[PDB]
């Protein structure tokens, strides 16, 4: 049974390209009017914390929900540093490999729907992830390019990054990936 997924959206790209909307659009996930209106106590992603997701959250997502600000990935690190503190607990996906047409085969930078099906299949959710995914045709590569990954990331073994991200300052690696974003 999918956890609660709820998602505050900066009405900014055309939502008719938007994977967020399409979440909301079949069910997967509820739209909430305000970042303030999204579950306390429930996981948010957050790919500007260094704190990674892990299987046992899984505890909190069926208990509390999870959440999701999405907005331009240009806005991204702007809108997470300054209007979520406190109320939630904050996790980074563990590192992935886009599979979207944007994006395809670059590190970290996922899209609302893939980061929504990584969250799930990390903390046991594998089905509801293939689902999710399901709603685009490129979805399901997205756990075929990242399997090796997964297998690792779904057991507890965060082990992966440093090889996969190819440095052993993870933490500096991902803070220049997304200033790539913010400053182009
Ligand atoms: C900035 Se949003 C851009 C939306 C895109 N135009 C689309 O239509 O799908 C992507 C959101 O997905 C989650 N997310 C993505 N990657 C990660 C990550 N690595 N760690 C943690 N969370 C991640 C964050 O909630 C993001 O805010």
């Known amino acids: 049974m999918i956890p609660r997924v709820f998602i505050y959206r900066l009405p900014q790209d055309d ?14 996930a509820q739209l909430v009017d305000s970042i303030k209106a999204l579950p306390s106590g429930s996981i948010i992603l957050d790919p500007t ?9 899984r505890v909190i997502a069926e208990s509390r929900g999870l959440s999701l600000i999405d907005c331009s990935w240009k806005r991204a690190v ?16 563990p ?9 395809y085969g670059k590190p970290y930078i996922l899209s609302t729907i893939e980061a929504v099906a990584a969250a799930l299949y990390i903390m ?12 685009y045709k490129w979805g399901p590569n997205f756990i075929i390019i990242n399997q090796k990954y997964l297998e690792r990331y779904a057991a ?8 996969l991200l190819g440095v052993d ?16």
């Open 15 to 28: 939502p008719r390209k938007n994977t967020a909307i399409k979440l909301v659009r079949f069910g997967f």
């Open 49 to 57: 914390v260094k704190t990674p997701l892990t299987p046992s959250d």
């Open 78 to 93: 702007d809108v997470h540093t300054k209007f979520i503190r406190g109320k939630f607990i904050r996790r980074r996906l």
């Open 95 to 103: 590192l992935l490999i886009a599979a979207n047409p944007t994006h």
């Open 124 to 135: 046991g959710f594998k089905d509801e992830a293939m689902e999710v995914l399901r709603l």
């Open 156 to 163: 507890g073994d965060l082990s992966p990054e440093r090889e």
């Open 169 to 184: 300052d993870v933490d500096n690696g991902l803070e220049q990936l997304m200033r790539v974003l913010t400053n182009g």
